[PDB]
């Protein structure tokens, strides 16, 4: 999932953009993947209960 960025592959962003414009895309990818990890860990806790 791109989460509103230009790509879902990080190396393509790092090869197509300069770093101060790659910042705002990598931030969106980090935010989406943190949301996915937190959802997974919460449901694993409730399922282990």
């Amino acid at each position: 999932s791109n989460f509103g960025a230009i790509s879902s592959v990080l190396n393509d962003i790092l090869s197509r953009l300069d770093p101060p414009e790659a910042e705002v895309q990598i931030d969106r990818l980090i935010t989406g993947r943190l949301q996915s990890l937190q959802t997974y860990v919460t449901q694993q806790l409730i399922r282990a209960a």
């Binding site: 190396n11 393509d12 090869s15 197509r16 300069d18």
Partner: protein
Amino acid sequence: FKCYGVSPTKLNDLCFTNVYADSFVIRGDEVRQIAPGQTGKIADYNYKLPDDFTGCVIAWYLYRLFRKSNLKPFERDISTPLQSVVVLSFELPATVCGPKKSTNLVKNKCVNFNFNGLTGTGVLTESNKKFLPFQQFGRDIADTT
């Protein structure tokens, strides 16, 4: 000179699969309207860039006055009303790719590889996966190369 989707430094390291080029006369003060997401008489009735543009605008005599609607991205109109600068566009088979000197293959090591503009790190072997005459790469169950 303003490259929107890519960087001007990074233009020499990629493969683009096609390159278009556009040419028209603007007055020199209406070069603002050749950006993504703009209005004006040029960006509504004459030449409309999409809201997701990958390319560079390079700028260093009739124009239309009226039209009943706004255009689509990359639309022409040669109908008859009308009364009196390079736009490169990319799309991401290489075929228009860039100037890098290659270096021959190395098997069985973790290496940094660059196959037609895709980077990575891993160990290259010889594959049993028989292809067809229409492939550039393959994928897996979890959608990775």
